[PDB]
Design a binder for this molecule. Structure first.
Ligand code: 3XR
Length: 512
């Protein structure tokens, strides 16, 4: 596809992918590049670094404050008050000022902007965080945290209980707890009243409490999360923790009866001799329809229709895509049409994997379900490709260097045969070194590098009261933490459907 044919397609990640491929082959001239960010659906990361090597975008400072950005630290006292206040939005600018000028400006702004006064006079001390904490300036606290993570201080009960009301709190709490940073901040957050937090924040404050062996506090935080969380899957995770900590059989019972299929509800069902959840059976009789499952532009279009459709239109689309050839689209539509209440675990292009053993089949299918929902031309924001969502680098390494395939192109990852084949190959590499399917899952999403480093630590996937469940909450990247939980449920399910059951309790034992 030339840049001309692409310009005639709707903006989408598919079209971004293809523009990025031209850019990486140096086929975009400085003239082609003029109109080009109007042709880019998501102007972020690699495609933007690459376009900026050709046309280094100058903007953006706002026409209204242009004059304000002509001053420096040495001339800011000659700026009008509006300009003084705008420039003082940057803590780096504040840190750059000399101390006499911070004193002057602190007085100028006392009455009208005490927030600026506080930051100014704080940077006149050897510890700005300590000054801000003493004023209980909550906006200033978060501005300082975002300027530098290195500040760490004990916070009293009054202060920590004010932090949850600021939008910054959730990412702050998660980040320092998951990363095991800012120990004084962490310890201080034991005194947050569960009444003052909810959802993810409450959940992470329970994980925090467990790391200090404050099991009562933890229960209280987990219970608040269970009550406040929107998603049933997240409630179940919280209810599991309530059960593990205080051992109330009504918690486990409630969890065994969840409509969400996840590792926590699966596990609770197995502990209470409850039958395995019902898995829908999708068996369309029509073989084919018009739709090209190998056209990535067709997918991007129909996906947008599906996601924007009223209850009525979903039904017209359900009927149209009720074919074997478009089975992954059928399932995708049915998932949105039943408001995410039924369990779909399809097995498309099955011929390509039926000769592998059943455990490997289940892992492949588990990964595919999470990566793409089996959409052959799926493209991520990082331009990972096909059902098994291969990064192009790896796809080219395997296809050209290892398997010496004639005329290999990375777009071969859009072929099911190739996606499953490469997925098998890469899963052998990972499972050979890692063994557990949970660990394989982590390494598949976030690299074997990061997985090996996490498993090398003496406080991750070792023996303990609350292991391996606690470790699964402390996986340092949120995306990988979530990916692994989901892939593991998928694996259990597919093993079951393939008559190769395994007890999830055995999986958990093999994590220690
Ligand atoms: C096996 C494989 O290619 N893993 C990759 N899958 C897509 C991910 C993404 O962030 O989109 C990563 O590139 C991951 O390493």
């Amino acid at each position: 596809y030339s840049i001309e044919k692409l310009k005639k397609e709707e903006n989408s990640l598919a079209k971004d992918y293809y523009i990025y491929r031209l850019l990486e082959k140096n086929k975009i001239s400085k003239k082609d590049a003029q109109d080009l960010n109007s042709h880019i659906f998501r102007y972020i990361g690699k495609i933007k670094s690459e376009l900026e090597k050709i046309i280094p975008l100058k903007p953006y400072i706002n026409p209204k404050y242009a004059k304000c950005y002509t001053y420096t630290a040495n001339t800011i006292l000659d700026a009008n008050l509006t300009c003084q206040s705008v420039r003082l939005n940057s803590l780096v600018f504040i840190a750059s000022l000399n101390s006499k000028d911070r004193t002057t400006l602190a007085q100028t702004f006392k009455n009208q902007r005490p927030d600026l006064t506080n930051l100014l006079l704080a940077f006149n001390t050897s510890d700005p965080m300590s000054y801000i904490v003493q004023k209980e300036d909550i906006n200033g606290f978060f501005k300082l945290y975002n300027y530098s993570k290195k500040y760490d201080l004990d916070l009293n009960t009054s202060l920590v209980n004010k932090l949850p009301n600021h939008i910054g709190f959730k990412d702050f709490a998660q980040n320092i707890i998951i990363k095991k940073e800012n120990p004084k901040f962490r310890h201080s957050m034991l005194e947050i009243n569960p009444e003052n937090v909810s959802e993810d924040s409450a959940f992470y404050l329970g994980v925090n409490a467990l790391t200090y062996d404050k099991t009562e506090l933890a229960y209280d935080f987990f219970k608040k999360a269970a009550q406040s969380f929107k998603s049933q899957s997240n409630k179940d995770n919280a209810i599991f923790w309530m059960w593990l900590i205080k051992n109330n059989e009504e918690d486990l019972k409630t969890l065994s009866q969840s409509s969400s299929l996840n590792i926590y509800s699966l596990y609770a069902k197995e502990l209470t001799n409850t039958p395995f959840p019902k898995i829908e059976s999708l068996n369309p009789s029509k073989k084919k329809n018009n739709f090209n499952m190998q056209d990535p532009f067709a997918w991007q279009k129909i996906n947008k229709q599906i996601r924007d459709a009223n209850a009525s239109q979903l039904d017209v689309l359900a009927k149209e895509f009720d074919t074997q050839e478009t089975l992954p689209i059928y399932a995708y539509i049915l998932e949105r049409k039943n408001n995410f209440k039924k369990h779909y675990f399809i097995m498309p292009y099955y011929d390509n994997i039926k000769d592998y053993n059943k455990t490997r089949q289940a892992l492949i299918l588990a990964i595919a379900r999470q990566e793409s929902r089996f959409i052959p031309t799926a493209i991520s924001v990082s331009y990972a490709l096909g059902m098994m969502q291969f990064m192009p680098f790896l796809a080219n390494h395997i296809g050209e260097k290892e398997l010496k395939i004639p005329n290999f192109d990375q777009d071969f990852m859009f072929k099911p045969e190739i996606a499953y084949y490469f997925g098998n190959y890469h899963l052998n590499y990972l499972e050979s070194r890692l063994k557990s399917p949970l660990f394989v899952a982590y390494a598949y999403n976030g690299g074997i590098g990061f997985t090996n480093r996490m498993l090398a630590r003496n406080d991750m996937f070792k023996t303990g009261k609350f292991e391996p469940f606690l470790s699964m909450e402390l996986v340092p990247y949120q995306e990988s933490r979530i990916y692994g939980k989901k892939v593991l449920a998928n694996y259990i399910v597919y093993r079951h459907l393939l008559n190769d059951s395994i007890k999830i309790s055995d999986i958990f034992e093999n994590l220690i």
